[PDB]
């Protein structure tokens, strides 16, 4: 109760002190909701600092209640006419900050006068307030007039106001009634580029964000935009550079073999992009993700820059992992020795998933080329002999992949793999080992016992392992018909009688209706030779990658997921 007593003061200075005490009490968690009318009464003053403090209080509290805050419209209208522009902008911003259904009717008329005046800061604040309005309860019919006012408000000589107006338009353009933004014709594009030249870093970023939605009619416009965007290599590190890289990569629709500007453009992309690996660790991580996507899209850019992506000892774990795959992306015939030496060096570290991904990278380098395949198979044998469990599982998955890549070349290792089978727990390793056993069942006379051992618990297990086991058993039967009736009958009965998955039941039936129809067709279909796989190494599906090229800057690239997968 003493809060009210100490707040109800007649001196203006002690009223200000009570105001900051109330702000501090709200910050620490105290509740002064019963003192709101007193603060409203004390609002009627002319002190700037008290004006800001009371406006902060008004936002923080009246955001929860519109009822008694309705009467504040008259005070806001009185405030938005005070000659000085600073408090005008503050008042209009705090007035727009209340998101209620009864404020739009009272703000539709007074807000019009704010968008048309001779002041850059006030115009910027008004544009931001219009963007604030359009978020909620602003579709109307006159709101089209407001958006037209914002749109032709682009015709300003101040970079800040035009930059924020363009950002607001880009954000509000999410609505798509088949009518896309109505604007950014070539003259507006030229004006936007001139502003980009004359803007600040933040509006530069906003303009580069918005500009990535135009479709050039001809190459000359694309050429002009390309040489008008290139000088964008600033001290803003990741933001401006990545936005320029995004817009350039989108504007590579001209023919690859044209006059020698395509090659020079590709040459331009390398220095500033590799420069990004010298900033803060988080922007380094973002740049590494973006470079991974770019290399996966266009691999003839970072061709001879492998040396920089060498993993350092002081780097954090996520940076280490992303530098590792970039390294594997850029490994080729010329850099085999040093890459494999580095991979062997990382293989002895203590961090778990880093060592897993390092041995996977060793195997993937093996997948890429043949001499690396032989040497990396030797290193995989050594790592298997090291007996470490997770390394063994990763090596088994890699060995399955290599067997798929190279047919009938590394048969001598299957006995060693079958020797250590009890150390498998993860579903991927079990599936890989089961497929290896099933495919090379002619060489192994002990495959029956292994598959029967995996057949003990058919339930309480991942569906992928069940499918792999079932297809391996069917393959083994079709290769050893004379003594494998019990296994196939049991596995088919388990699939089609107790499995809850309609996927597994479907596979059980699709094989059951084949093994009893025609053995010639069973041999021809199931055991049909499978073509080579031709450098499948950790690629993203091309449609997803192409859709992700349009979103280089955003979190879509960082998360490696489409924007529709998370709102």
């Amino acid at each position: 109760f003493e809060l009210k007593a100490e707040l109800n003061n007649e001196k203006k200075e002690k009223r200000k002190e009570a105001v900051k005490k109330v702000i501090a009490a709200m910050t620490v968690g105290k509740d002064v909701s019963s003192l709101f009318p007193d603060v409203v009464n004390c609002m009627q003053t002319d002190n700037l600092e008290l004006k800001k403090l009371v406006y902060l209080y008004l936002m923080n509290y009246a955001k929860s209640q519109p009822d008694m805050a309705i009467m504040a419209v008259n005070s806001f209208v009185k405030d938005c006419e005070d000659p000085n522009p600073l408090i005008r902008a503050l008042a209009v911003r705090t007035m727009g900050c209340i998101r209620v259904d009864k404020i739009t009717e009272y703000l539709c008329e007074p807000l019009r006068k704010c968008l048309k005046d001779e002041d850059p800061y006030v115009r910027k604040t008004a544009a931001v307030c219009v963007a604030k309005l359009h978020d909620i309860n602003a579709q109307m019919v006159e709101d089209q007039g407001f958006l037209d006012s914002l749109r032709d408000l682009i015709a300003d000589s101040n970079p800040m106001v035009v930059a924020n107006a363009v950002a607001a338009l880009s954000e509000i353009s999410e609505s798509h009634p088949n009518s896309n933004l109505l604007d950014l014709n070539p003259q507006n594009i030229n004006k936007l580029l001139t502003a980009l030249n004359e803007c600040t870093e933040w509006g530069q970023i906003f303009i580069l964000d918005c500009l990535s939605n135009y479709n050039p009619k001809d190459d000359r416009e694309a050429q002009s935009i390309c040489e008008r965007v290139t000088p964008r290599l600033s001290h803003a590190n990741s933001a401006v550079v990545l936005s320029a890289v995004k817009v350039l990569m989108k504007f590579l629709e001209l023919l690859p073999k044209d006059s020698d500007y395509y090659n020079m453009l590709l040459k331009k992309l390398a220095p500033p992009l590799v420069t990004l690996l010298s900033g803060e660790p988080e922007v380094q991580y973002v740049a590494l993700r973006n470079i991974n996507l770019i290399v996966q899209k266009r691999p003839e850019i970072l061709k001879q820059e492998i040396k920089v992506f060498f993993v350092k000892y002081n780097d954090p774990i996520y940076v280490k992992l992303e530098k590792l795959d970039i390294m594997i992306r850029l490994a080729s015939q010329a850099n085999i020795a040093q890459v494999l030496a580095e991979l062997k060096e990382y293989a002895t570290e203590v961090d778990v998933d880093f060592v897993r991904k390092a041995v996977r990278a060793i195997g993937r380098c093996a997948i890429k080329v043949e001499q690396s395949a032989e040497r990396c198979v030797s290193t995989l044998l050594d790592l298997i002999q090291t007996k470490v469990n997770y390394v063994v599982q990763e090596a088994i998955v890699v060995i399955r992949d290599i067997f798929r890549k190279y047919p009938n070349k590394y048969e001598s290792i299957i006995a060693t793999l079958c020797e250590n089978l009890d150390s498998l727990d993860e579903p991927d390793a079990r599936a890989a080992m089961i497929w290896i056993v099933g495919e090379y069942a002619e060489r192994i006379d002990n495959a029956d016992e292994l598959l029967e051992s995996f057949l003990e618990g058919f339930h309480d297990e991942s569906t992928q392992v069940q499918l792999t086991l079932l297809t391996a058993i069917v393959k083994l039967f079709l290769k050893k018909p004379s003594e494998t009736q019990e296994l196939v009958q049991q596995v088919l009965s388990l699939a089609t009688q107790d499995s809850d998955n309609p996927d597994l039941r479907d596979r059980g039936y699709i094989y059951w209706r084949l093994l009893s129809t025609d053995p010639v067709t069973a041999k021809e279909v199931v055991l049909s030779e499978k073509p080579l796989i031709s450098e499948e190494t950790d690629l993203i599906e091309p449609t997803l990658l192409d859709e992700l090229i349009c979103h280089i800057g955003s979190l879509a690239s960082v998360y490696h997921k489409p924007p529709n997968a998370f709102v």
């Binding site: 309609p502 279909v525 073509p531 091309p542």
Partner: protein, 613 residues
């Protein structure tokens, strides 16, 4: 006071990072090497100081694996502080040894044969605090004669009763049931009400494990309860907690009475009814004190009485009064009271005599769900809503759970979706509503739904036949919407591939359009979804000769044939070779009507049962 411990705390508590305290522990190790390893150690003060210092070091968060044999040497002492330090140190740290443990047993055996309450109390506290194999084998049948065959102080009696509780809990095998139960159940009416508390706890545990052994306690228990509930407002002021007469004692007596069936003697149950109406009437009056603790104690004893009434399930008037009290409590200002009332009504909802009375509070339950905006309270509300679910409400109750799913943070989403799935499956008469509800669940939550719910939905759609046409339709008009979650893709692929012949009649849903929509969904999905869509593609090849060429053109590209995953490659090769042969006989023979699923397990119920606890 002791200066050493105070200096220790004041100095080492306010120091720098871990290296400083590590170096100070090293210095302490040097000091103990200097002194304990050899020399001549004093008896009382030095040993007390270093033992308490090492105990404090252990409590700080460090580990000590030595220095207790000379500490257990301290057990045989005359002064109380030394003995307490020794017992506390041997209780806090437990070691695996044979000679030292036997020395501990000899010392405690010598100590137990004392003639003062304090030493026996400390010995019993040490026995009950830890418990061990040697203590169990040596202190099994000799504690009862301290309890039964002895007129000693009350403190040692309570300690011995709780020691019997602990030993029976940890080693029931070697505790006999001999001729000692006569007085232990008889002392339930003893004075000082503390021996009463200990005996009530012990007998309650024993009856919870061995009910028929102590059936005679009912009469004394009900007599004590009747005396306690209404004797006087100023009687035994020592055991009155804020004007409430013995809350904990009454709670424990009510718990003891709950483990037994209603008494055969009509007089005993008559007294029970009398004291129950007495408790309810006493709770009816406005509080005698404005303090919240008085209300908390009164509501505690009232809730225990209500739980006993629910367990008995024999008095209709008592049940009606309890339900009225719960309905009054549903709008109580205190949050704890509302939460406890919700839990108690969820427990009570299983009673058939008050099922309609529980159902009459559905509007208040819905308002509480929509108003308080808590997490535990709203989980209790949805549990009670599930509890009161006879058919009678199915549409409204399912809609309310759907809304609460629409506003549900992280994991209550999963619990709600499982509960809604099982409830809709169990209480649906027109299964078209069930399919619509399932699609609503998939659309609303999507990311956090299940892995078994869509299994069950596919099983229902396949099994029930007649509803398959509407299911296939609604799925088709739901697929082409801009909002299409991943699980919806799988369910739609399976159902539509299986039953496209029912929808092929409409020109708006030509098979070419269905295949194009499925392929448009194909390029952005995980591996299992792509496998399901490939199976649907081959089923279309069986069912739709018109689109045979286009499909065969689809799964022949190098993206879907040279893929990086084993399963997709195998499925593509198999289906492509089946379509290439196309004998028109084998392919039609293979993919048959696929008879409906049998009622195997109803895995949703098992999953939700396992999720509990």
């Amino acid at each position: 006071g002791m200066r050493g411990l105070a200096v220790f705390i004041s100095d080492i508590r306010n120091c720098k990072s871990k290296e400083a305290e590590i170096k100070r522990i090293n210095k302490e190790l040097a000091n103990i090497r200097s002194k304990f390893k050899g020399d001549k150690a004093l008896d009382g003060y030095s040993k007390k100081k270093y033992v308490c210092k090492l105990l404090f070091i252990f409590l700080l968060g460090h580990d000590i694996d030595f220095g207790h044999m000379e500490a257990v040497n301290l057990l045989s002492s005359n002064r109380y502080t030394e003995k307490q330090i020794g017992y506390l140190f041997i209780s806090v740290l437990v070691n695996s040894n044979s000679e030292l443990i036997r020395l501990i047993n000899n010392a405690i055996k010598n100590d137990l044969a004392s003639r003062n309450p304090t030493f026996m109390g400390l010995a019993l506290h040490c026995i009950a605090n830890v418990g061990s194999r040697e203590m169990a084998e040596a202190f099994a049948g000799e504690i009862p004669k301290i309890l039964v065959a002895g007129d000693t102080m009350d403190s040692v009696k309570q300690s011995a009763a709780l020691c019997l509780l602990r030993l029976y809990r940890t080693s029931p095998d070697l505790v006999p049931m001999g001729d000692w139960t006569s007085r232990v159940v008889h002392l339930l009416n003893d004075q000082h009400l503390g021996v009463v508390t200990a005996a009530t706890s012990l007998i309650t545990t024993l009856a919870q494990k061995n009910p028929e052994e102590f059936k005679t306690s009912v009469s004394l228990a009900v007599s004590r309860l009747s005396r306690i509930v209404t004797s006087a407002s100023t009687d035994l002021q020592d055991y009155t907690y804020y004007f409430v007469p013995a809350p904990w004692l009454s709670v424990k007596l009510l718990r003891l009475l709950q483990c037994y069936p209603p008494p055969e003697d009509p007089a005993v149950r008559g007294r029970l009814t009398e004291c129950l109406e007495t408790i309810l009437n006493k709770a009816q009056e406005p509080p005698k004190s404005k303090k919240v603790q008085h209300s908390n104690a009164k509501n505690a004893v009232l809730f225990e009485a209500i739980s006993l009434i629910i367990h008995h399930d024999s008095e209709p008037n008592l049940l009606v009064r309890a339900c009225n009290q719960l309905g009054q409590f549903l709008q109580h200002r205190e949050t704890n009271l509302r939460y406890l009332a919700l839990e108690s009504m969820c427990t009570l909802a299983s009673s058939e005599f008050s099922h309609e009375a529980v159902k009459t509070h559905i509007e208040t339950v819905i308002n509480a769900l929509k108003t308080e905006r808590d997490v535990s309270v709203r989980q209790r509300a949805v549990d009670l809503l599930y509890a009161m679910c006879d058919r009678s409400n199915a549409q409204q109750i399912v809609a309310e759970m759907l809304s609460y799913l629409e506003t549900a943070d992280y994991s209550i989403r999963e619990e709600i979706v499982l509960k809604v799935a099982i409830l809709a499956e169990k209480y649906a008469v027109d299964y078209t509503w069930y399919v619509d509800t399932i699609l609503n669940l998939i659309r609303i939550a999507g990311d956090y739904v299940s892995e078994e719910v869509w299994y069950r939905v596919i099983q229902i759609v396949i099994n029930r036949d007649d509803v398959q046409g509407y299911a296939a339709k609604t799925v088709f008009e739901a697929l082409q919407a801009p909002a299409c979650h991943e699980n919806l893709v799988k369910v739609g692929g399976y159902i539509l591939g299986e039953f496209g012949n029912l929808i092929a009649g409409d020109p708006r849903s030509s098979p070419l359009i269905q295949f194009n929509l499925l392929h448009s969904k194909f390029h952005l999905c995980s591996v299992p979804t792509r496998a399901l869509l490939l199976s649907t593609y081959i089923k279309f090849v069986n069912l739709f000769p018109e689109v045979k060429a286009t499909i065969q053109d689809v799964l022949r590209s190098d993206s879907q044939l040279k893929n990086a995953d084993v399963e997709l490659q195998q499925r593509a090769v198999e289906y492509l070779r089946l379509s290439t042969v196309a004998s028109t006989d084998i392919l039609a023979t293979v993919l048959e009507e696929m008879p409906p699923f049998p009622e195997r397990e109803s895995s949703i119920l098992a999953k939700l049962k396992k999720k509990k606890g």
